[PDB]
Amino acid sequence: FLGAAGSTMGAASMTLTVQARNLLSLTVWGIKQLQARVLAVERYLRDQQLLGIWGCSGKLICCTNVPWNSSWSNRNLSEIWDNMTWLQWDKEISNYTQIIYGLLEESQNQQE
């Protein structure tokens, strides 16, 4: 679990299943425990909803028809797959992904 946190993204793309598997699992204690379980289930479902919106519900890697706008990143396909980790990507792409999810919704709902 999480072992590829420091590995490159290409070398961390073959360990997706382990991360995906751990996303699913007096009285006052039971309230908190059951609430945490239901919350985890809701996150899994509400993010699978996103996956199925883009038309790849059953897949772990989805390739779409959205063109990669240069306005984000603007770097080589070798540096960003053999010389970085995903955590380094999160900080750079953050505060753009909320529009990418759009242009990922549309380019699937409307194009197909």
Partner: protein
């Protein structure tokens, strides 16, 4: 180049979630071993002063303490007029007046009958109105502990739910705030012991290769300094006061355990440390305290300022009784750039922990001489914070909120939230 979506991506963000017990066999047993995975080449920002684990652990420990006191007797009849005289037994001069012999009237099993009984009460529990009353009758009626339930700190582990991870900082020189080059992910924490103490961390976890010094703001005199010891300094605490508990039937199925007759002489309960070990440990503390305070400073250790007995004294629980020891003989020294120290201790039976008012517990007397040996593995100090005109700064034992006790244990742990949605450009398309 087209957007490609990845699920199962290893990226995380700081979160404030709820963790559950792992009480080894309202808490579940652990696995055969809490396996950990070392994350290579990862640098994570840690800050133990904003850690949510130290707050949830506080609430959990308060709640478990409350739960063990639900099925136990409520000493409502104990709030009566006590006629107390002095013990005047084979006492020493330091135990003059500390214990009182009180006679009083309690309800029997039968509601129409009353019994005249006696008990020995420490001075800190009675307040005069020769007529006294228990100190709590003004605020609440104390809940006596069930004689079977113990106050031993049993190890608990906090395990994160699905979709969260616990990051452990393995960096040795980690000072509590900043980047941690060596990071592992654990299913959940090691055995952490909820040891309740003030001014002195007991039987905790030691540092490696140096004595560590931690603070939210080393220059702010209002933030307690946490000192973590390289080697333990062992305390021997005893109560040489051979005791006898007698049960008094105060209702239909309710028993109150009262101090009977102390057979033999009566002496101060006391703790002992080795002079040499304490001096070496304070030498290490001063050496590591200079690194933050200039190589030319003069370091003074003095005793606590004043106030409640629960803060001015080293308070702990030794074999089921609650000790409050006078830590003036330890913190009394000036440092310039086989003996034993005996700390006198008082004993209380009516205790209101965690600064809560209106909920009090009465610790039943424990039969026979009580001895305990334990390790000092840290201090909670506080600088005086005077003026820059002087080159001497004094440090006094602290003893504030109990979270400082659990910070010294959950300082290498942080909780993170796994975000498994990742978008990256790839050729593929369609």
């Amino acid at each position: 180049l087209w957007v490609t979506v990845y699920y199962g991506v290893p990226v995380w963000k700081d979160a404030e979630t709820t963790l559950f017990c792992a009480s080894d066999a309202a808490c579940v047993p652990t696995d055969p071993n809490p396996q950990e995975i070392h994350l290579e080449n990862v640098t994570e920002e840690f800050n133990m002063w904003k850690n949510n684990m130290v707050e949830q652990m506080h609430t959990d420990i308060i709640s478990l303490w409350d739960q063990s006191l639900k099925p136990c007797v409520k000493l409502t009849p104990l709030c009566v007029t006590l006629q107390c005289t002095n013990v005047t037994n084979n006492i020493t001069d330091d135990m003059r007046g500390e214990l009182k012999n009180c006679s009083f009237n309690m309800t029997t099993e039968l509601r129409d009958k009353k019994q005249k009984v006696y008990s020995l009460f420490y001075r800190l529990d009675v307040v005069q109105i020769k007529e006294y009353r228990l100190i709590n009758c003004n605020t609440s009626a104390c809940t006596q502990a069930c004689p079977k339930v113990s106050f031993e700190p049993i190890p608990i582990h906090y395990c994160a739910p699905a979709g969260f991870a616990i990051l452990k900082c393995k960096d040795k020189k980690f000072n509590g705030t900043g980047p941690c080059p060596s990071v592992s992910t654990v299913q959940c924490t090691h055995g952490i012991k909820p040891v309740v103490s003030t001014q002195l961390l007991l039987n905790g976890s030691l540092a490696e290769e140096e004595v560590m010094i931690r603070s939210e703001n080393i220059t702010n005199n209002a933030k307690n300094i946490l000192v973590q010891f390289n080697t333990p300094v062992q305390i021997n605490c005893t109560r040489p006061n051979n005791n006898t508990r007698k049960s008094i039937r105060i209702g239909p199925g309710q028993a109150f355990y009262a101090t009977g007759d102390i057979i033999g002489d009566i002496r101060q309960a006391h703790c002992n440390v080795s002079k040499a070990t304490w001096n070496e440990t304070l030498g290490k503390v001063v050496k590591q305290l200079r690194k933050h305070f200039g190589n030319n400073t003069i370091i003074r250790f003095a005793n606590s300022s004043g106030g409640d007995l629960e803060v001015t004294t080293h308070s702990f629980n030794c074999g089921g009784e609650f000790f409050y020891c006078n830590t003036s003989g330890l913190f009394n020294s000036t440092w310039i750039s086989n003996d034993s120290i005996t700390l006198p201790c008082r004993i209380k039976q009516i205790i209101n922990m965690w600064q809560r008012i209106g909920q009090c517990m009465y610790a039943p007397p424990i039969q026979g001489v009580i001895r305990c040996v334990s390790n000092i593995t840290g201090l909670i100090l506080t600088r005086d914070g005077g003026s820059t005109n002087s080159t001497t700064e004094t440090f006094r034992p602290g003893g504030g909120d109990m979270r400082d006790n659990w910070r010294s244990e959950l300082y290498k742990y942080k909780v993170v939230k796994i975000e498994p949605l990742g978008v990256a450009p790839t050729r593929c398309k369609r």
